[PDB]
Amino acid sequence: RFEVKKWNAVALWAWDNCAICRNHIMDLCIECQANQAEECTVAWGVCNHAFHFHCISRWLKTRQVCPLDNREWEFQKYGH
Amino acid sequence: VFLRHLCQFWPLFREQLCRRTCLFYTIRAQAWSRDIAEDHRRLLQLCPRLNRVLRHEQNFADRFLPDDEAAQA
């Protein structure tokens, strides 16, 4: 017979517009959609989310984490 | 109804009631401390008494004081 002295198990946490302002992913920025005449380019970050430069500028000026995945936001500068 | 109307005249009633509560509760606290100092083995029973006191105050707040700020005071 055999006996178990220790063990390790594994599992995955299995579960898309601009969630922060909820406008359509390719659409414009609601903050500036109130003040019609649309200047926010989309911003990408290492954590692989796409948000509006306006949204992110404000939010980051408030807090310094990615609002979607709890990591320090890093403006993606690869390929640029 | 009358308690609410008195609560709707706020300063004097609030002040009097607050003083009375302070006095009553602090006398009670000194009494409990004096009882507790007698034997160390009573804190285990001391917990539910605090539970019931908090229960009674929460009930009073939920039934007789409309506004929040008064309740938190």
Binding site: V10, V46, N48, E74, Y78 | -
Partner: protein, 72 residues
């Protein structure tokens, strides 16, 4: 020298595939963290750092589960 080039993505893809088995064969030693503190800025998306951080988050979760049992 690979950083900032195109080859970064394929190198990182290949690196993940061995770091996986290495972490499951041995806990995250000093070696993996040191190699990463050397060559980290080469990996474009920072996947390996995230695997390493994942092991630590899991130990934290173990602590919380213990407390939750006590409360129940």
């Amino acid at each position: 020298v690979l950083s900032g080039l195109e080859l970064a993505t394929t190198f990182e893809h290949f690196y993940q595939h061995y770091m996986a088995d290495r972490l499951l064969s041995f806990g995250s030693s000093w070696l993996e963290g040191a190699v990463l503190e050397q060559i980290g800025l080469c990996f474009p998306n920072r996947l390996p750092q995230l695997m390493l951080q994942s092991l630590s988050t899991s130990e934290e979760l173990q602590r919380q589960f213990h407390l939750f049992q006590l409360q129940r």
